[PDB]
Ligand binder design. Structure first.
Ligand SMILES: Nc1ncnc2c1ncn2[C@@H]1O[C@H](COP(=O)(O)CP(=O)(O)OP(=O)(O)O)[C@@H](O)[C@H]1O
Ligand SMILES: Nc1ncnc2c1ncn2[C@@H]1O[C@H](COP(=O)(O)CP(=O)(O)OP(=O)(O)O)[C@@H](O)[C@H]1O
Ligand SMILES: Nc1ncnc2c1ncn2[C@@H]1O[C@H](COP(=O)(O)CP(=O)(O)OP(=O)(O)O)[C@@H](O)[C@H]1O
Ligand SMILES: Nc1ncnc2c1ncn2[C@@H]1O[C@H](COP(=O)(O)CP(=O)(O)OP(=O)(O)O)[C@@H](O)[C@H]1O
Ligand SMILES: CC(C)C[C@H](N)C(=O)O
Ligand SMILES: [Mg+2]
Ligand SMILES: [Mg+2]
Lengths: 159, 306, 205, 201, 308, 162
């Protein structure tokens, strides 16, 4: 299946956060969220926005570059991956595979554009590009969720 | 007191037997896959040391990876049960701090310590009773992370820190003036994500620059924000003994800038000179003699701190 | 003889035989494996007055199941038997599930994996356990094809039942037939390897 | 809630539920019921830190089984709950056996008795068991007849296997559906008595 | 020390609550058969009057008796112990009978010999100064009670045999016929009665125009001789002049007379019970053991052939 | 109710005990032995000789007329019953039936003949009759367990000249 792309040009930091909130508060359990973006793109600060939807502080979202995995246990459990410093594939094979068995918890993956083969086909892809020093562009791919894309285009239309 | 130490928090799997906290009877290291390796190492250990002799079993219960930790923690409790000896679950960060007092025998209990590494950046107070709390903490990236990712951005090899260290020696700091993201705040917290991106923006904008100049100016940014917040806290808590633990503590720029500030203001500053398998046993032994053992119902938590 | 057998592939399952005495324990609760397994093994051994060094073989469930569960499991056993190099009896979790059922015939065992995938084996239990299809990862569709093909009498899915008494019997059997191994020889059944590799092929097609 | 269930029809089966924690214990050995049942109930209650007075309901296997086993059982429960008049959930042992099987369908439960006679029942186990044939004594030949009539999928013969978890569930269910009894109302299943009379006739 | 006692050793079921000594707060019996059916009822009625939280010790007979009957009281008692979180005492029934001699007479000297003669029990036992006791004499065959009942049957007299034979022998002539005293003039304090029983059977098979009254008395005298000799002989060789009689056949007027005659001659104190209260007997025995802090483990099995 | 009869005549006490031993030591387990015989026929005495085969003392064999049932735990378990006093059928119905499920414990019932219907069809009947004052006659009814008949007829040879 082919996901509906929802483009967003020149978002501020808080606008980007708010979007992350809107998305995550609106999905059900057991979804994968692939964050694509190069260094400096708000991959991790997007997850700040995400944690708002699980009624936790933004302060506890921190880069998993070294920790490899952060889990935020809230209204829903968020698994925050950062594949930047991944050396051993077996972590995906075993550990990450074991998480994908969780049927009511969300996974977001910084640098999840690596190892394309691995992720479930119906994964939510999120791409972030640098517009200027204080603005970003994001395009969100969501596959055939009647309720999802509708709730997202609302904020797209709320520009 | 022969204490057996298991390490499955770090990338190397390790098993160490220590007598009285100061005598290595046996130290085995793999040199990753903990469940495959550990049994081999325990084999090798029990071939040399007789099992009856072990007095206490010790292993890390965090922080780290839930999966990596359980293997050591789980194995140690089984050893504890089978040997009929007590078990100690060691807090890894706590153990690092205690090794400052291990390196320096004649050290006063009230101390302030900066932990600056990859994925660890905090300021902690050590009380007189040797209890400790985290007072300052990074909200975004670690300092080490900033070194590694900025090095990448600059087009410099791994590892970020030592490479940026070396190239900055040929450069002029304060040539460019990057932001010090949390400096002059009512908090002892740190931010580095802002600094990291600021470098990127400069790399996108400017053209004529020297890499040496950018590196040294970024380094001096970091080393300013580290030095201020560390000495500010030491001041407001009336401690003039301050210790620098962790990977980026290696940084010669930081070492110099700390030394300068610690000659003007009359302060004692302590730096490190790490061994992993022993450090667990040493922490175990230390807790064993205070008779402070861990329950068998102890789960691993990967975000253990304080 | 003296046998301890355990499987943590799903729930905590412990069988312990001391000469003529067999005791079984199971635990279903919100507590994690790491919180409960050692605590019970300690208490059961105390109550029966049994040193670990007194055990003649220790069975351990290795077969397809939850990663965290199997890890706490295997590692616990590694610790118990390492000081005394007690023969280890590796126990295929599914096979124990099949054997745990009373009825005989064609049996299918299944466990959910990553959405749209399943761990799956099928056995003939008539006389002994004869493997019809070996444990492997299958797509939701491929499971239904297998069900139809093998027309199984018993289906065991999602919520598996393992009798600790069966775990012991098997360990004793394995001990008899000289099929036990050292604690440093254990190789788990990580079916979560296959699933990533199949996703790639069928994601491309 | 807090539930203690036990069946002594063959082996000693004890289930105990305290809030979110469900423990199952079984025993099979040389040691008699009287010398092993109370010992375990005591330790298990100590370990979970719960007084008997803290129990919501206590389930007991009464259904067809070994007389001296059932006696030790029911008595034990009578002792435990008498000081507090705790709701008692009488459990049919044969039903507990069938319900303990994982697979569904037509299930025959058959235990040996004296010289070519049997205790026997058969059920349908779709969601909960429905009784196809009520528990009663049969001859060796009458069992075989019953076997071919019903062509059972699962046959539980002689070595009947009861999961204590099942016992707990059933008690919980019986407490909910207001079908629990006092300790002074317990009526066992004395299937044995018949055997004598049926031999004559 | 509120001690709850349960009795399910044979026949009537019983529950009693007792205080420090003879301070009966509650004593319920079934007599006013089916233990498992009965016991709960009794425990109900007991807890209706006595608050359960008050009981300090729980005690029940662990033998001798019927494996099945015993298990009901034994098991229930342990359950009561477990729920009440109080200690449990498993009582010996023969020791309980003996104890009640000291209960029936408060001022009784510890060093004592005792004959126990009933259906299914015939023994001689010594009670020490510390109240410990061993069985020194014992029936190898039938009990004196049995002999009485079975011989009464042979004579075609209604049950129980003892009372009937007692009454009809009063009109009969003892030592009209002379049946053996099987174990008399031995080195031993042991009893046999099977030889006497069959003897009577042979006499009745070699029938005559004998009076039944005569046969009964002649049999009775035979038994009362062998009972008196071995009881007095022991008490002598042990240097005790206090001797107590317990059991059903202790009610035999012929034995009573012949003991009393022989205990007038030698200054000997003889103690018979009155011409019951089986629940309290257990409670007393419990309390006694409780005071010495001798409690029974929960792994305690019932054995039907408990003695000493 | 006719099966294989093995008549013996004018057996002394010790000859009768020796026969009991030779019967019981040849039992497999889980068999019922009904003792018929009038008062003092020598039933309890026969169980005295039965206990030899479970390597216990004869001294612990005593009439269970009042005790209802004695249990002798030896190389096997002997359930000595005495239904002389029995008044309530339920004891047979419940307590005795339960025991009959045991596959490898011997049961010997003084006065079993009183409740004739209750017993298994494959029961070993032993009838005893008093020949004289010191001698008794025993007959053993055994149905199809031809194994034991061989060992019991061997005894005959030891009694040849008595
Ligand atoms: N529109 C915007 N959205 C997000 N962040 C923005 C932003 N404009 C500016 N920023 C700044 O950009 C920085 C983003 O940092 P991070 O979220 O750590 C990027 P990342 O992609 O997670 O890093 P990584 O590539 O090292 O993993 C913050 O300092 C934030 O304040
Ligand atoms: N001489 C030096 N100057 C500056 N930074 C240095 C340095 N040597 C190492 N570093 C930095 O320190 C980090 C690694 O620190 P180490 O303490 O050796 C492992 P860590 O991953 O930081 O451990 P942690 O998981 O306990 O935080 C890297 O980011 C590296 O660039
Ligand atoms: N007046 C009497 N003379 C002789 N024997 C008598 C008798 N009154 C009763 N008996 C005998 O006493 C026996 C019954 O005793 P009871 O006291 O009723 C129960 P028990 O047999 O004593 O039980 P126990 O020995 O288990 O304690 C019978 O054998 C009966 O013949
Ligand atoms: N040849 C013989 N065989 C067996 N017993 C003999 C015997 N000759 C004499 N006797 C005697 O006869 C008596 C046998 O009686 P027991 O067996 O003790 C009672 P019973 O026959 O079991 O019937 P019961 O149920 O009425 O008590 C003993 O005194 C025994 O010594
Ligand atoms: C409907 C939108 C075009 C309105 C406008 N973006 C607000 O703000
Ligand atoms: Mg990041
Ligand atoms: Mg007799």
């Amino acid at each position: 299946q082919k996901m509906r792309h929802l483009r967003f040009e020149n978002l501020t930091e808080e606008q980007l956060k708010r979007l992350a909130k809107i998305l995550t508060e609106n999905l059900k359990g057991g979804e994968v969220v692939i964050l694509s973006g190069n260094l400096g793109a708000g991959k991790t600060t997007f997850v700040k926005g995400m944690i708002r939807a699980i009624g936790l502080d933004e302060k506890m979202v921190k880069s998993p570059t070294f920790t490899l995995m952060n889990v935020y246990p809230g209204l829903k459990t968020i698994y925050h991956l950062d594949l930047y410093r991944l050396q051993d594939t077996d972590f995906l094979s075993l550990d990450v595979e074991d998480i994908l068995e969780d049927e009511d918890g969300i996974m977001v993956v910084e640098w999840g554009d690596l190892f394309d083969g691995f992720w479930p086909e119906d994964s939510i892809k999120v791409k972030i590009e640098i517009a200027d020093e204080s603005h970003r562009n994001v395009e969100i791919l969501i596959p055939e969720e009647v309720n999802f894309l509708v709730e997202k285009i609302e904020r797209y239309r709320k520009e | 007191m022969r204490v057996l130490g298991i390490e499955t928090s770090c990338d190397e799997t390790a098993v160490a037997v220590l007598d009285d906290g100061k005598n290595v009877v046996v130290n085995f290291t793999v040199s990753r896959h903990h469940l495959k390796n550990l049994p081999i190492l325990l084999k090798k250990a029990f071939e040399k040391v007789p099992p009856e002799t072990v007095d206490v079993v010790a292993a890390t219960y965090g922080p780290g990876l839930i999966g990596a930790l359980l293997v050591g923690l789980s194995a140690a409790k089984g050893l504890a049960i089978s040997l009929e000896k007590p078990f100690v679950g060691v807090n890894h960060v706590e153990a690092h701090v205690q090794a400052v007092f291990l390196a320096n025998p004649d050290l006063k209990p009230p101390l302030v310590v900066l932990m600056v590494s990859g994925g660890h950046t905090q300021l902690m107070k050590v009380d007189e009773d040797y209890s400790m709390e985290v007072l300052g903490e990074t909200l975004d990236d670690s300092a080490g992370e900033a070194f590694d990712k900025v090095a990448r951005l600059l087009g410099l090899g791994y590892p970020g820190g030592p490479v940026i260290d070396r190239v900055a020696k040929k450069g002029d700091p304060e040539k460019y003036s990057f932001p010090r993201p949390m400096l002059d705040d009512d908090s002892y917290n740190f931010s580095f994500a802002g600094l990291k991106t600021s470098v990127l923006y400069f790399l996108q904008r400017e053209k004529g620059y020297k890499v040496e100049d950018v590196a040294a100016s970024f380094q001096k940014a970091v080393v300013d924000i580290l030095v201020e917040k560390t000495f500010r806290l030491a001041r407001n808590l009336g401690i003039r003994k301050i210790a620098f633990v962790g990977g980026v503590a290696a940084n010669s720029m930081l070492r110099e800038e700390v030394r300068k500030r610690a000659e003007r203001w009359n302060y004692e500053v302590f730096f490190p000179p790490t061994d992993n398998a022993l450090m667990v046993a040493k922490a175990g032994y230390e807790k064993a003699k205070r008779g402070m053992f861990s329950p068998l119902s102890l789960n691993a938590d990967p975000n253990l701190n304080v | 003889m003296n046998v301890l057998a355990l499987d943590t592939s799903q729930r905590i399952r412990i069988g312990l035989r001391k000469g003529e005495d067999l005791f079984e324990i199971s635990y279903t609760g919100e507590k994690k494996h790491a919180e409960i397994l050692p605590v019970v093994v300690k208490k059961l051994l105390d109550e029966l007055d049994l040193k670990v060094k007194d055990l003649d073989v220790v069975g351990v469930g290795i077969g397809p199941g939850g990663l965290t569960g199997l890890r706490v499991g295997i590692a616990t056993v590694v610790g118990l038997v390492s000081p005394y190099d007690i023969p280890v009896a590796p126990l295929n979790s599914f096979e124990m599930t099949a054997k745990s059922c009373p009825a005989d015939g064609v049996v299918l065992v299944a466990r959910r994996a990553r959405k749209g995938y399943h761990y799956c084996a099928v056995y003939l239990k008539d006389k002994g356990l004869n493997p019809l299809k070996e444990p492997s990862v299958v797509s939701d569709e491929e499971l239904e094809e297998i069900t139809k093909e093998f027309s199984p009498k018993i289906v065991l899915k999602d919520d598996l039942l393992i009798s600790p008494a069966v775990l012991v019997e098997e360990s004793e059997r394995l001990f008899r037939e000289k099929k036990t191994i050292h604690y440093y020889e254990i190789e788990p059944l990580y079916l979560q390897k296959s699933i990533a590799e199949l996703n790639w092929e069928k994601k491309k097609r």
